[PDB]
């Protein structure tokens, strides 16, 4: 019955039909085992492309917001506000769940470090979106919690994988995106990202079979924000 | 800013 | 009030949140008056979009369940089953609400040849739609309801709309693809196609500066599907 | 078969 569950998830996937592989792999989070690669890589597909959606929404209406608030055009702005405020509710209601998923059964029956790595990372992002759109003090929250769990993702990794491992490398990524856009700080965005970079290139050799091309788009993101910040 |  | 919907229905759209233009679209077909062209478009294409998505993934999982049909795979079939058939159950309820919208408040209120064209076309295209998926005896019902639209818009069409009209090459050409696809009928939808193009050709002079390029396309496309067919 |  994990096996149907992952198979209605790659099913759900094809199809395109996120809600469903979402459903899918809760079900199997809600197992308390530890979840195979496969599971983790369609969770984390599963929960980023619905949240993506909505993302992508929230910013195409902000565009709007921000024009129609430059002309003053301000009966649209009414219509506008309350179409952004609630795709935000989305956004929180999603995010809320797959923190909560973690932190009641992922995080808990985690024992490899990879898999540590990988939900604190997760939980990281997950704040950070909520982040990336709230005001004043629900900011300043999601940024507390989205540092403390970088910090704890980068505790685990920085002693356990390989400076070349793509998840490490996808945590230094995320990690330095977050300072540049949540803390506004491109001095440690920087420092964070130039480090994880040269690290990785300063150990090539580790670099798995499994995993090089992954690790090396990592790293040409790595270099591509570098370029953007300075 | 590009994430992963 | 009306103008604010039809604005939703555009932010929506910009947002590709497709749901709720339909919702948006819904509430204007319900004040029974006669929509502008616009507002057609606006319906059309938020209808598209919502029963467009369960098209693409009814393709997708009846392929998927085609191949689990000829290696033998009986465990998975009955998930892939399960499957195409809560998807039918999305098509179905789709349809019948667009469907009822136009006997219940479209095509009652509708007063111009232009806009009766469309809503007995849209009419035959969503019952072919139910027909596309259906078996036995409500694939029957379906494709009688659809023959029945399509004749409905022809009479009105071939006696109102320049035969250049984009209407009525779109009721053509969907009329034809009916005849092919449905009521597997090669030499109907051939003579049909080939006349409607015919009948364009001989008046090009009647197309509008509004439409020539939906004409143009309606019939290119007319000339793809008879290659297709011969 | 391609429709509009």
Same mark, same amino acid.
């Given at each position: 019955?994990?096996?149907?569950?992952?198979? =209605?998830?790659? #099913?759900? *996937? =094809? @199809?395109? %039909?996120?809600?469903?592989?979402?459903? !899918?792999?809760?079900?199997?989070?809600?197992?308390?085992?530890?979840?195979?690669?496969?599971?983790?890589?369609?969770?984390?597909?599963?929960?980023?492309?619905?949240? &993506?959606?909505?993302?992508?929404?929230? %910013?195409?209406? !902000?565009?709007? *917001?921000?024009?129609?608030?430059?002309?003053? &055009?301000?009966?649209?702005?009414?219509?506008?506000?309350?179409? %952004?405020?609630?795709?935000?509710?989305?956004?929180? $209601?999603?995010?809320?769940?797959?923190?909560?998923? #973690?932190?009641?059964?992922?995080? +808990?029956?985690?024992?490899? &470090?990879? /898999?540590?790595?990988?939900?604190?990372?997760?939980?990281?992002?997950?704040?950070?979106? $909520?982040?990336?759109? @709230?005001? &004043?003090?629900?900011?300043?929250?999601?940024?507390?919690? /989205?540092?403390? @769990?970088?910090?704890?993702? !980068?505790?685990?990794?920085?002693?356990?994988?390989? +400076?070349?491992? +793509?998840? %490490?490398?996808?945590? @230094?990524?995320?990690? /330095?995106?977050?300072?540049?856009?949540?803390?506004?700080? +491109?001095?440690?965005?920087?420092?964070?990202?130039?480090?994880?970079?040269?690290?990785?290139?300063?150990?090539?050799?580790?670099? /798995?079979?499994? !995993?090089?091309?992954?690790?090396?788009?990592?790293?040409? $993101?790595?270099?591509?924000?570098?370029?953007?910040?300075? | 800013?590009?994430?992963?």
């Amino acid at each position: 019955d994990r096996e149907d569950l992952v198979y =209605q998830a790659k #099913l759900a *996937e =094809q @199809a395109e %039909r996120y809600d469903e592989m979402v459903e !899918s792999m809760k079900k199997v989070a809600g197992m308390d085992v530890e979840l195979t690669v496969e599971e983790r890589n369609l969770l984390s597909v599963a929960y980023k492309n619905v949240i &993506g959606a909505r993302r992508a929404s929230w %910013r195409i209406i !902000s565009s709007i *917001e921000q024009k129609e608030e430059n002309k003053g &055009g301000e009966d649209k702005l009414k219509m506008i506000r309350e179409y %952004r405020q609630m795709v935000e509710t989305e956004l929180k $209601l999603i995010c809320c769940d797959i923190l909560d998923v #973690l932190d009641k059964h992922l995080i +808990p029956a985690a024992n490899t &470090g990879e /898999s540590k790595v990988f939900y604190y990372k997760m939980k990281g992002d997950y704040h950070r979106y $909520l982040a990336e759109f @709230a005001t &004043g003090n629900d900011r300043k929250e999601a940024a507390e919690n /989205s540092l403390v @769990a970088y910090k704890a993702a !980068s505790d685990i990794a920085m002693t356990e994988l390989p +400076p070349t491992h +793509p998840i %490490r490398l996808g945590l @230094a990524l995320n990690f /330095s995106v977050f300072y540049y856009e949540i803390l506004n700080s +491109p001095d440690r965005a920087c420092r964070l990202a130039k480090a994880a970079f040269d690290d990785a290139i300063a150990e090539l050799d580790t670099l /798995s079979e499994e !995993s090089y091309k992954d690790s090396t788009l990592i790293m040409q $993101l790595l270099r591509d924000n570098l370029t953007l910040w300075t | 800013s590009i994430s992963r």
